[PDB]
Amino acid sequence: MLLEAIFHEAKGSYAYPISETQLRVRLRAKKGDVVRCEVLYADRYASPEEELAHALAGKAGSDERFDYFEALLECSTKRVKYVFLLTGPQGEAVYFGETGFSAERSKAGVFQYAYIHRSEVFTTPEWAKEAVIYQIFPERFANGDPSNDPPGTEQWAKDARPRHDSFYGGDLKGVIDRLPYLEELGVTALYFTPIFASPSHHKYDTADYLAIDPQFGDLPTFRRLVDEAHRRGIKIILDAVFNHAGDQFFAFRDVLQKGEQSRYKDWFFIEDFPVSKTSRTNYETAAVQVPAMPKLRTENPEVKEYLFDVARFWMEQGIDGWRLDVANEVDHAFWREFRRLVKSLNPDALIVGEIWHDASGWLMGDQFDSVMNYLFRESVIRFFATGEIHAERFDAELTRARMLYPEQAAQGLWNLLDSHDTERFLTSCGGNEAKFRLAVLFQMTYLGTPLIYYGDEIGMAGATDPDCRRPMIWEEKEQNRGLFEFYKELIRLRHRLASLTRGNVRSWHADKQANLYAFVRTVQDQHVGVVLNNRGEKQTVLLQVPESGGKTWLDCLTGEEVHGKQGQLKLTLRPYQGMILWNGR
Amino acid sequence: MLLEAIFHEAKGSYAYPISETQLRVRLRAKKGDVVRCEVLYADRYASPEEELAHALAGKAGSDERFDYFEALLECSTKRVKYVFLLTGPQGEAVYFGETGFSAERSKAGVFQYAYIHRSEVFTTPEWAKEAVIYQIFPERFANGDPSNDPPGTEQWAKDARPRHDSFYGGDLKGVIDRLPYLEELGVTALYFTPIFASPSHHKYDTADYLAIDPQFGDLPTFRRLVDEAHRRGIKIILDAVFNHAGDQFFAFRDVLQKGEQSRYKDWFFIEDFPVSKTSRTNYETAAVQVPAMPKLRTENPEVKEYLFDVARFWMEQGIDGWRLDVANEVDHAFWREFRRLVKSLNPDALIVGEIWHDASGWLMGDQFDSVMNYLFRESVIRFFATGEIHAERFDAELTRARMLYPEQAAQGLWNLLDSHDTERFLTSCGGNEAKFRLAVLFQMTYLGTPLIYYGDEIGMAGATDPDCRRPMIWEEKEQNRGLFEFYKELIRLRHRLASLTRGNVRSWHADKQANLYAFVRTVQDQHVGVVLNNRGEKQTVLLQVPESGGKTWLDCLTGEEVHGKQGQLKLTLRPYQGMILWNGR
Ligand SMILES: [Ca+2]
Ligand SMILES: [Ca+2]
């Protein structure tokens, strides 16, 4: 076995506590090099001649190139040292520890998780563990008050095709007026893109962090939304853009006028004076050469304190969480402290980040609760929509992203299909609803938090920005109530099947030919196996089902009962059909 | 090449800044597996059509199983994305990125270091980079004040062989009287084991954090010691026992008297009252069943604040840093805040921890400045002392550990040859002074901060505790002035050769048969080579030396001037003789 491909670390995503006396440990190895992984451990202060504890690490999954083994160590003393006993195909015994590899245990040394502090056990809000988030782009969701529509607002019709500068008048009132609809669907939370006062159309260049932009509504209106949403069981998540402020931001304005003599000169990253010029920026800004968005020096305590105050303000209005924008550019110190604050005001406030790359440094538990799961979108798009990859490959990408962070994070990653910055998934599937349904079926049964982009639930289509931001279709006649009802059912099943919300994920079957993928969600004794026939052909499949997990299963989508014989389940899936088999326990 | 054995991450010890605009990158792969590692990178927002910047990753070293490539990235934007270009022994090329591996650059994906904030750049005290520390065992260094000796103190003589309950009267006053000696030796700091009010002999069970143990002196004397030491260019480091307190601790005693009625019961970990019993305890303690050492709940704001105040008090007295004890058992949050307090009070205050296992998590730059290099000792014991490992193996251990943490930490690790909890190194050398001397030569020229155990410089000997805690030999005729002068010369050389304090390390030669090891420390244009012939026989060797690094060398220890001919250097070493070649640049 290739010893240089085996990996572990007493930290990060490979060693972390799930409670004060339970330590989870993961081990990576060349796919196929290890067939049996066991952990021998003991208290760190245990006598040398003491009997070691045993814990078998079951194989948690495999990806494109590696195998991952996982074990749960019981540590009543909250202190543990451990060494891996890896067994290969030809029965070779190799010990693995901090010192390195060796046929003799003692020479391998041992890994150590010094101590488990409860304040360091990754914890996220309970409602978010079984939530269903709904993204709302205010300007295009619903116009509840025409009195606030800016000049040039265009007609609200299904045949309307937005342009970069188009205006439809969507506002908060609109949302309040539609909560009944959103309640019917079963969404548990609403996620709003920036909606704070700004002079631009997109509102990412914050003019006043303490006020709702006039075109969307006012503070009194926002409070009404918060409450009305709250009694329907819907939480509110606001989008915070702390990485940079807008060029209308009061503090920035003082710099544009007082320059060097500005009480806030150190609140930003300014090269030299005069403070500005057209087409040329002499101060750091968002991305590259964007004068409207001067970068904020979050490292500056005064800046820190203001942003925190901004945070305090809106949490006082009763919001439930924040989706951080371009957070990976704000110092960790800030986020570590932001968390501390946000949680102190409301232990149940959610903190979701947006980072387009391995976000581990932010998902250890002392910073964000989760991040947008773009890896999930890439995988479902290339698998369900374009077909660039087959089911077995789909399985790989899926497994790899999953082993990225600790389980507490994986469970609350937002699984999006699209957003206001990309084309609508139905478009991605080329108008093929049969494909859309299977992907939605997956989205609703996989590990993570399902996020629905406004309108997709009733069949809205569209190209990328700005064709993805078309006016919400409210004409019951123009809506795909068929698809809508589909979401309802799925959201329903996900709320009653504890396994779909808080269970683990283990691949069940993968076939590059049949392009059929199946996985099993498990929590306690309940098992729910999802089978995806991503192929336009009626197919039969024989699945392995060890009798231990049950002898009878129910397909929650058809009520059809399927029985297993001698460890096998014969399933017949119509073109692009998905099955949700509950073990009834 | 075997891709499953190649490793990298956009964080930790494999990706970190060294400046606000410079990012170091490390990559490892199977030994011999890769021949060229290039880093192609650009700003995170750079246009897809722009050319990528190139960066050559030199092989920073290699251990028993891996090769380590390291490169430096120039990021003027403080934002960078990059991909690796790896070539095998057969010229086959492949890109390595976050996405995975591919012959195509784009399909490899790209690693990303989102942003480099100045507050996150690992920064350690400048004086610590070129320091030489002397570990003082208060009770056994010098007795300047007979009136404060503990009852039953024994005669201070060379033939004395300490026992567990022995006493000799060493105290702070003694250290003061001997400050001239330390100054002559050349030490720039003193490390004191615990010296705070405690009922026991060892003083690890803190009774009073704010007072010096009467047998050692009092605050006035401590102030005097700090001042007399400072004027001599010597700093003061105290040992902080924050993981647990003594059972005589004002807080613990209160709970002991009032049980659940005490306002300090939540400062400890108690399962049920009343609180007390011998060999058995109803409260968590350091290690296993140690009544006199109840664990402090450092997670508690009150407990946190007290120790932080305790710190303030001593720093107000003028100390230069702390040695944390069992630091790996207190929460990280505590340690991060400790650092902020400490540096705000004195940016040049050192924070050294003691972890007996991979300490990376505490060495990212937001916690400790470095830790004791227990690894160094291990390699030195087995290499120079017992000879259990040969020069090539020694090479591996040394190299592997070097790559364990970020260069800023690696550079300041405390490299000890022994301690008060171990036998003296000379004894480990079975009394062989040649074996001992050669080790000191390596210690005084290798990467990290040399830590001299009191008396080792004059040839003290002894088995592990308590025989290593014999009273310091002060009678000049009874001291080994040869050894002493040896340390002095090596210590003086280390201060003049910038390479020896601020230079990197590269293996120069490793011969398992001749048991000769050589390395070179480099900074700017200066190169200093160290050749150690760890054999009791006269040996001759041919070292490589391309004319680029010079053709002339000087043995700083002997003054002998050697010359390289045709890129080769002829060296003749005497038994256990070491050579320090300075290229005079
Ligand atoms: Ca409106
Ligand atoms: Ca004394």
mmCIF file of N, CA and C and ligand atoms in Angstrom, chain A residues 143 145-146 148-149 169-171 215, ligand 1:
data_model
loop_
_atom_site.group_PDB
_atom_site.id
_atom_site.type_symbol
_atom_site.label_atom_id
_atom_site.label_comp_id
_atom_site.label_asym_id
_atom_site.label_seq_id
_atom_site.Cartn_x
_atom_site.Cartn_y
_atom_site.Cartn_z
ATOM 1 N N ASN A 143 -44.210 43.179 -5.799
ATOM 2 C CA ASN A 143 -44.448 44.607 -5.544
ATOM 3 C C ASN A 143 -45.735 44.817 -4.716
ATOM 4 N N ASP A 145 -46.283 47.630 -2.853
ATOM 5 C CA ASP A 145 -46.534 49.093 -2.823
ATOM 6 C C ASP A 145 -45.885 49.810 -4.023
ATOM 7 N N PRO A 146 -46.704 50.248 -4.995
ATOM 8 C CA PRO A 146 -46.267 50.949 -6.209
ATOM 9 C C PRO A 146 -45.759 52.359 -5.899
ATOM 10 N N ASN A 148 -43.530 53.230 -4.027
ATOM 11 C CA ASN A 148 -42.091 53.274 -3.830
ATOM 12 C C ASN A 148 -41.328 52.839 -5.072
ATOM 13 N N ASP A 149 -42.040 52.631 -6.173
ATOM 14 C CA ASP A 149 -41.367 52.206 -7.394
ATOM 15 C C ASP A 149 -40.662 53.336 -8.087
ATOM 16 N N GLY A 169 -39.982 47.149 -9.518
ATOM 17 C CA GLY A 169 -40.640 47.628 -8.320
ATOM 18 C C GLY A 169 -40.831 46.684 -7.155
ATOM 19 N N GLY A 170 -40.178 45.522 -7.180
ATOM 20 C CA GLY A 170 -40.316 44.580 -6.077
ATOM 21 C C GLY A 170 -39.961 45.231 -4.745
ATOM 22 N N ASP A 171 -40.723 44.909 -3.705
ATOM 23 C CA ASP A 171 -40.482 45.483 -2.390
ATOM 24 C C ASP A 171 -40.843 44.556 -1.258
ATOM 25 N N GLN A 215 -36.563 52.350 -1.993
ATOM 26 C CA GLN A 215 -37.271 51.617 -3.042
ATOM 27 C C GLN A 215 -37.758 50.249 -2.581
HETATM 28 CA CA CA C 1 -42.577 48.695 -4.932
#
